[PDB]
Amino acid sequence: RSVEDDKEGHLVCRIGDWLQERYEIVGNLGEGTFGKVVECLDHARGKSQVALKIIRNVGKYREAARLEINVLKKIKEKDKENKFLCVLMSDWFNFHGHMCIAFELLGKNTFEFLKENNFQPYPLPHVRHMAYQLCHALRFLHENQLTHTDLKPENILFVNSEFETLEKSVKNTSIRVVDFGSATFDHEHHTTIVATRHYRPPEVILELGWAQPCDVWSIGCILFEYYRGFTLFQTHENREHLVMMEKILGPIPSHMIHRTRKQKYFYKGGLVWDENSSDGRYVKENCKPLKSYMLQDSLEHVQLFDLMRRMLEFDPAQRITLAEALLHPFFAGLTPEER
Numbered sequence: 001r002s003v004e005d006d007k008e009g010h011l012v013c014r015i016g017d018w019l020q021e022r023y024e025i026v027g028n029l030g031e032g033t034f035g036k037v038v039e040c041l042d043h044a045r046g047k048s049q050v051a052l053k054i055i056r057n058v059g060k061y062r063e064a065a066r067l068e069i070n071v072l073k074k075i076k077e078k079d080k081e082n083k084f085l086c087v088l089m090s091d092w093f094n095f096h097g098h099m100c101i102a103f104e105l106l107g108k109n110t111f112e113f114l115k116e117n118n119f120q121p122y123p124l125p126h127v128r129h130m131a132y133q134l135c136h137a138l139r140f141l142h143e144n145q146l147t148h149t150d151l152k153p154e155n156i157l158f159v160n161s162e163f164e165t166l167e168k169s170v171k172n173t174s175i176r177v178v179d180f181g182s183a184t185f186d187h188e189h190h191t192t193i194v195a196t197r198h199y200r201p202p203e204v205i206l207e208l209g210w211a212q213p214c215d216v217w218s219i220g221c222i223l224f225e226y227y228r229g230f231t232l233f234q235t236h237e238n239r240e241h242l243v244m245m246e247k248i249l250g251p252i253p254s255h256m257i258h259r260t261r262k263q264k265y266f267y268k269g270g271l272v273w274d275e276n277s278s279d280g281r282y283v284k285e286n287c288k289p290l291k292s293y294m295l296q297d298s299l300e301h302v303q304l305f306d307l308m309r310r311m312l313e314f315d316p317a318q319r320i321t322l323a324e325a326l327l328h329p330f331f332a333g334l335t336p337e338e339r
């Protein structure tokens, strides 16, 4: 039956409407300037649960999602045994201008969970299993001329976020990667600024080109966050961010300085920073060498920090690959099953 759009290009629909005389809406799950994501029953797969992404009837959002779908196709094509932890897309159609993409319902994101637990960090066993899934999934993606570009706790969902009480622990540490809306093939237009602030690597800030090494940094940042419960780089300005990195991580390689069109942030090869000034006192207090954030001395932890540091190399050409990461002695600590 006839549908309708609003003054802004959103499909008009609430809980109880159908699309394709197949999908029944029964929940709201997310919204934005892309459109809606609604829970549905696939009344042509015995009423099984789906997340349906419904995109605004607008040129740029609709073309953005043409590519989102190409990526999901490539993935489904490559991960037949269903083993590479990237979200399965079950369906996709152009509904009266609106692109819709259905996926398997999943549970809470690793951000929602963390904040529902008062920002106390995941045990290290959990950190290890999730780091492993993440390394496993994006390696798959990277041997397929793809880069995700927007990895963060919000974009990683528990299959099943049922928790126990202790302070909360997730019964099941299985996660999916999600939101391939930003993912770029090696051969296609690289958007310049990419990733959300906290998870953004230096070669992007310095506008020096990016590729797969972009996602590895994102992961290094995310693991720090799983391990401490709080972000590595708590800033919203490019100059402070580069200074925090240097204070947490070490001196930027001078070749990356020689090369960046972002000269404004540098004088005679040094970053411009007022140590003795409001923002100074704060970063001096708070931004410390990576090894300082270790919460215990034991091996598992040292093994973790070596991976994080390798994931957080300034020179993207130097940074660890995820194929390398998979062999790291941090991942000798894994059970048979967790393997």
Ligand SMILES: Cn1c2c(c3ccc(Cl)c(Cl)c31)[C@H](C#N)C1(CCNCC1)NC2=O
Pocket (backbone or CB within 6 Å): 029, 030, 031, 037, 051, 087, 103, 104, 105, 106, 107, 154, 155, 157, 178, 179, 180
């Ligand atoms: C709850 N949720 C959401 C998405 C999902 C994609 C797949 C699945 Cl199975 C779920 Cl449950 C999702 C969307 C995507 N991609 C995003 C869109 C941007 N942030 C990441 C998830 N928002 C959701 O509400």
Ligand SMILES: [K+]
Pocket (backbone or CB within 6 Å): 197
């Ligand atoms: K923020």
